[PDB]
Design an enzyme around this catalytic site. Structure first.
Site, PDB file in Angstrom:
ATOM      1  N   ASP A 136      -9.066  11.090   0.670  1.00 57.02           N
ATOM      2  CA  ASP A 136      -8.781  10.660   2.022  1.00 57.02           C
ATOM      3  C   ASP A 136      -7.313  10.804   2.356  1.00 57.02           C
ATOM      4  O   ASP A 136      -6.728   9.891   2.915  1.00 57.02           O
ATOM      5  CB  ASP A 136      -9.198   9.202   2.181  1.00 57.02           C
ATOM      6  CG  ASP A 136      -9.059   8.707   3.592  1.00 57.02           C
ATOM      7  OD1 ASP A 136      -8.713   9.510   4.471  1.00 57.02           O
ATOM      8  OD2 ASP A 136      -9.296   7.509   3.824  1.00 57.02           O
ATOM      9  N   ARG A 140      -1.738   8.062   7.735  1.00 60.27           N
ATOM     10  CA  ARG A 140      -1.818   6.625   7.624  1.00 60.27           C
ATOM     11  C   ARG A 140      -1.702   6.153   6.184  1.00 60.27           C
ATOM     12  O   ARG A 140      -1.102   5.128   5.913  1.00 60.27           O
ATOM     13  CB  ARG A 140      -3.110   6.118   8.250  1.00 60.27           C
ATOM     14  CG  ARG A 140      -4.372   6.679   7.631  1.00 60.27           C
ATOM     15  CD  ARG A 140      -5.592   6.189   8.388  1.00 60.27           C
ATOM     16  NE  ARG A 140      -6.835   6.437   7.670  1.00 60.27           N
ATOM     17  CZ  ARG A 140      -7.555   7.544   7.790  1.00 60.27           C
ATOM     18  NH1 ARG A 140      -7.154   8.510   8.599  1.00 60.27           N
ATOM     19  NH2 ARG A 140      -8.675   7.685   7.102  1.00 60.27           N
ATOM     20  N   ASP A 154      -4.115   4.039  -1.546  1.00 56.48           N
ATOM     21  CA  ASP A 154      -5.553   4.024  -1.234  1.00 56.48           C
ATOM     22  C   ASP A 154      -6.339   5.209  -1.765  1.00 56.48           C
ATOM     23  O   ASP A 154      -7.402   5.535  -1.256  1.00 56.48           O
ATOM     24  CB  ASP A 154      -5.856   3.771   0.250  1.00 56.48           C
ATOM     25  CG  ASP A 154      -5.477   2.385   0.692  1.00 56.48           C
ATOM     26  OD1 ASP A 154      -5.075   1.581  -0.163  1.00 56.48           O
ATOM     27  OD2 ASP A 154      -5.583   2.098   1.898  1.00 56.48           O
TER      28      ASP A 154
HETATM   29  O1  LIG Z   1      -5.043  -1.728  -3.403  1.00 57.80           O
HETATM   30  C1  LIG Z   1      -5.249  -0.909  -2.590  1.00 57.80           C
HETATM   31  N1  LIG Z   1      -4.774  -1.043  -1.239  1.00 57.80           N
HETATM   32  C2  LIG Z   1      -4.018  -2.201  -0.847  1.00 57.80           C
HETATM   33  N2  LIG Z   1      -3.810  -2.597   0.457  1.00 57.80           N
HETATM   34  C3  LIG Z   1      -2.981  -3.799   0.504  1.00 57.80           C
HETATM   35  C4  LIG Z   1      -2.627  -4.196  -0.804  1.00 57.80           C
HETATM   36  S1  LIG Z   1      -3.255  -3.194  -1.859  1.00 57.80           S
HETATM   37  C5  LIG Z   1      -6.014   0.321  -2.996  1.00 57.80           C
HETATM   38  C6  LIG Z   1      -5.064   1.136  -3.849  1.00 57.80           C
HETATM   39  C7  LIG Z   1      -3.915   0.550  -4.329  1.00 57.80           C
HETATM   40  C8  LIG Z   1      -3.037   1.279  -5.091  1.00 57.80           C
HETATM   41  F1  LIG Z   1      -1.911   0.694  -5.567  1.00 57.80           F
HETATM   42  C9  LIG Z   1      -3.303   2.597  -5.372  1.00 57.80           C
HETATM   43  C10 LIG Z   1      -4.451   3.186  -4.884  1.00 57.80           C
HETATM   44  C11 LIG Z   1      -5.331   2.455  -4.120  1.00 57.80           C
HETATM   45  O2  LIG Z   1      -6.491   3.051  -3.628  1.00 57.80           O
HETATM   46  N3  LIG Z   1      -7.123  -0.127  -3.778  1.00 57.80           N
HETATM   47  C12 LIG Z   1      -7.163  -0.234  -5.209  1.00 57.80           C
HETATM   48  C13 LIG Z   1      -8.556  -0.760  -5.582  1.00 57.80           C
HETATM   49  C14 LIG Z   1      -9.137  -1.047  -6.817  1.00 57.80           C
HETATM   50  C15 LIG Z   1     -10.436  -1.521  -6.871  1.00 57.80           C
HETATM   51  C16 LIG Z   1     -11.160  -1.711  -5.699  1.00 57.80           C
HETATM   52  C17 LIG Z   1     -10.585  -1.426  -4.475  1.00 57.80           C
HETATM   53  C18 LIG Z   1      -9.274  -0.948  -4.423  1.00 57.80           C
HETATM   54  C19 LIG Z   1      -8.382  -0.553  -3.243  1.00 57.80           C
HETATM   55  O3  LIG Z   1      -8.675  -0.588  -2.103  1.00 57.80           O
END
Ligand SMILES: O=C(Nc1nccs1)[C@@H](c1cc(F)ccc1O)N1Cc2ccccc2C1=O
Length: 267
Positions: A136, A140, A154
């Site tokens: 993706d 953004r 993400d």
């Molecule tokens: O944490 C993420 N986004 C955030 N938004 C606000 C604070 S963190 C995102 C993510 C973080 C990262 F450091 C690197 C790659 C990522 O894809 N992740 C990780 C993860 C693990 C298990 C289930 C869902 C997710 C998920 O959505």
């Protein structure tokens, strides 16, 4: 290295940055147990549907996110387990790159813009080395730590316009497919946040790609750069430029941004 498990007391969430079906993101302050220092953090709370199977899957991904170690790649600092699942990531003060270019369109410079592409490419290369497909890539999803420094988040978890034709047609995702998304992301930066294929239905897009139509070359950029964007969108996945290769071209372009990119008045 490892992903810390965080006690609820350790961190407090100040405000909500974004809302999504998957989860709602908050801006928060986290104070590590045993440490005087306070760190601003971005907190993501999964909205619902906790399941034992789901929890294991979530945890497994979380460990990998924590494992990644690149300057241009976001790393998951920790996770907090209670009734709901919350993921803690170090906060990027500036926010998404797409938002930043959109409100800062008048004052942006080619050197900064060219440099961002190199950074994204460098970040992408690490993921390729780590056998991770972002799936993706978008404007953004690139976060601005500072103007000089940018990171990607993400990755590892639809956006039809951004995705490659191969992925759309046959649900196929690869590093080469990510490159097509990367080209689109560059186009967003070049066009200062204009939506790709504005006013065009998602269903139509696949046909257009088959017809050979591509997004319009940006006014700001030089002819050589546009070619790199076109190369990314080429139908043969193998034909598309490798990320490592991409870094070199942009870096060379970065040395003399004015020639390759022309916008307004610049040094
Ligand atoms: O944490 C993420 N986004 C955030 N938004 C606000 C604070 S963190 C995102 C993510 C973080 C990262 F450091 C690197 C790659 C990522 O894809 N992740 C990780 C993860 C693990 C298990 C289930 C869902 C997710 C998920 O959505």
């Amino acid at each position: 290295a490892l992903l810390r498990i965080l006690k609820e007391t350790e961190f407090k969430k100040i405000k909500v940055l974004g809302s999504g079906a998957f989860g709602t993101v908050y801006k928060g302050l986290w104070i590590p147990e045993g440490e005087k220092v306070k760190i601003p953090v971005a907190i993501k709370e999964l909205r619902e549907a906790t399941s034992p199977k789901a929890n294991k899957e979530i945890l497994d991904e979380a460990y990998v996110m924590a494992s990644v170690d690149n300057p241009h790649v976001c790393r998951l600092l920790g996770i907090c387990l209670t009734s709901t699942v919350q993921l803690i990531m170090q906060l990027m003060p500036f926010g998404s790159l797409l938002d930043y270019v959109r409100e800062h369109k008048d004052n942006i410079g080619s050197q900064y813009l060219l440099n961002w592409c190199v950074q994204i490419a460098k970040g992408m290369n690490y993921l390729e080395d780590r056998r991770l497909v972002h799936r993706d890539l978008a404007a953004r999803n690139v976060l601005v730590k500072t103007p000089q420094h940018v990171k990607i988040t993400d990755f590892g978890l639809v956006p039809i316009k951004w995705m490659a034709l191969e992925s759309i047609l046959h649900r196929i995702y690869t590093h080469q497919s990510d490159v097509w998304s990367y080209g689109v992301t560059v186009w967003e930066l070049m066009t200062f946040g204009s939506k790709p294929y504005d006013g065009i239905p998602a269903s139509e897009i696949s046909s257009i790609l088959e017809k050979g139509e591509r997004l319009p070359q940006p006014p700001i950029c030089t002819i050589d750069v546009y070619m790199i964007m076109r190369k990314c969108w080429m139908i043969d996945a193998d034909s598309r430029p490798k990320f490592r290769e991409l870094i070199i071209e942009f870096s060379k372009m970065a040395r003399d941004p004015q020639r390759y990119l022309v916008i307004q008045g610049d040094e």
